[model samples]
Target: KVFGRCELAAAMKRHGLDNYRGYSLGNWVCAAKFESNFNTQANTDGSTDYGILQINSRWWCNDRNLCNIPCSALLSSDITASVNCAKKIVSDGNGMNAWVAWRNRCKGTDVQAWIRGC
Candidate 1:
């Protein structure tokens, strides 16, 4: 749940998500900052959002679709499943817009600094 920005960027790149769906890695990083503050176990209401990217169970994932993983699995320190699910969401054309935090804090903003030290 505690990851440095460079570590996150490296992880995302290792997962083949550097430019998945044409969105920059910075966009994902910035969204993560606001959505979950990089807390993998972050939860709210009845739904849970997991990992650095905060993949949520309310609309994007569940027991039978997308990443096909239990939401709790994303709470683990390993982020492989979370990253995979995020990639699926992006492939569905939602991009960062799927996350309200991205719309309010990252949309139309320059997030290049998120990847600056990586």
Candidate 2:
């Protein structure tokens, strides 16, 4: 699925990420592939949803509008949003643990169940 440029910009800003680069793109693509197969519209029960990097909507659910937007709206066309989210998740060594768990437990299995641990 593709995202609009401004839409991706919004996601990057919302997640606090910088401009795109090579390594960042690689990590973002890797994590996104494992997380939601890069599905921005991906959600669990219409609530616990994640975008490119698969950060749970619950992470920002306090905002109320976090999950209200269509998943497609949450995604950006470029690597901006995905890369930013990945950076945040990888900032702490433990941050990537959730991403790692996705590969280990949720890659081809029950994503909802795998998310329970995240």
Candidate 3:
């Protein structure tokens, strides 16, 4: 599921990412653009990162299953599993900085424009 900027913003907000844990919805939208470009299927064939937000295997899925679902679940376009898992990633205290794209690109960019009118 590849998404337009505002489309993903509305989806993230609808799913409760708006200002989640003090990070703006733009924070999420911007990070997604840089990380996986708002697409569900990406970087296949031996890649560790999965789904729209690139939740990795080390802590959240496959090995730990801390998100309490199969890692394959994230590969689906439905997004519910990965979205819930994403919330868990932040709730576990990793924060939005958990995404390297957020730590690198989004942290310095004008993220508000990502969702200015959404």
Candidate 4:
């Protein structure tokens, strides 16, 4: 099946967050819901931000030499790059981890309790 940009983005986000968060899968869904509206092709017009993770293309490529890889390489959608980006954001403590934590706290549900803890 042909996946939409948002689907791939959601997948990348889900996979990356789960890779780190363990029991926070549902939390990923919650955050993605508001973050990108689950839209992988979600892009800000003429803005450097693009892709599922909303990574600015400038981070990986200069705007003048903007290669589609970061913003539009669907075939070569680098989940690893996305994960690394996510990791950086998380390290900053202002990213998906915080988002997940918020959801987990808001839900009053430790998703960790529902699944195997990593």
TM-score of each: 0.84, 0.44, 0.87, 0.45
- Candidate 1 lDDT over 41-82, as tens digits, reads 664564666666777677666724566777777887767888
lDDT of 4 at 30: 45
Best by lDDT: 3
Residues 1-118 of candidate 3: C-alpha lDDT, one tens digit per residue: 7888888888888898888888888998888888888898763454488888988877688834688887888888666787898888887776887887899888867889988876
- Superposed by TM-score, candidate 4 places the C-alpha of residue 29 at a distance from the truth, in angstroms, of 2.0
Per-residue lDDT of candidate 2, residues 18-102 (tens digit)? 3333222223334455666655655445455455565566553332433234334445545444454455445545544557644
Q: List the candidate 4 regions with Cα displacement exceeding 4 Å.
A: 1-16, 19-23, 43-46, 57-61, 64-80, 95-118
Candidate 3, which ten residues in sequence have the lowest lDDT sum? 41-50
Question: Given candidate 4, what's the lDDT at residue 11?
Answer: 64
Among these predicted structures, which one has the highest TM-score?
A: 3
Sorting all predicted structures by lDDT, with the top scorer first, yields 3, 1, 4, 2
Candidate 2 weakest lDDT stretch, 10 residues: 18-27
Which residue runs does candidate 1 get wrong by more than 4 Å? 43-46
Q: Which pairs clash in model 1?
A: none
**lDDT (Cα, 0-100) at 1 in candidate 2:** 60
Residue 71 deviation, candidate 2, in Å? Answer: 8.5
- In order, how many clashes per candidate? 0, 1, 0, 4
lDDT of prediction 2? 0.46
User: Which lDDT values do the candidates have, in the order given?
Assistant: 0.76, 0.46, 0.82, 0.47
Q: Look at candidate 1 and tell me the lDDT of residue 50.
A: 62
Query: Candidate 4, residues 46-112: lDDT per residue as tens digits?
Result: 4555444445564443444333244454213344454455555556545454454344553555533
Candidate order, TM-score descending: 3, 1, 4, 2
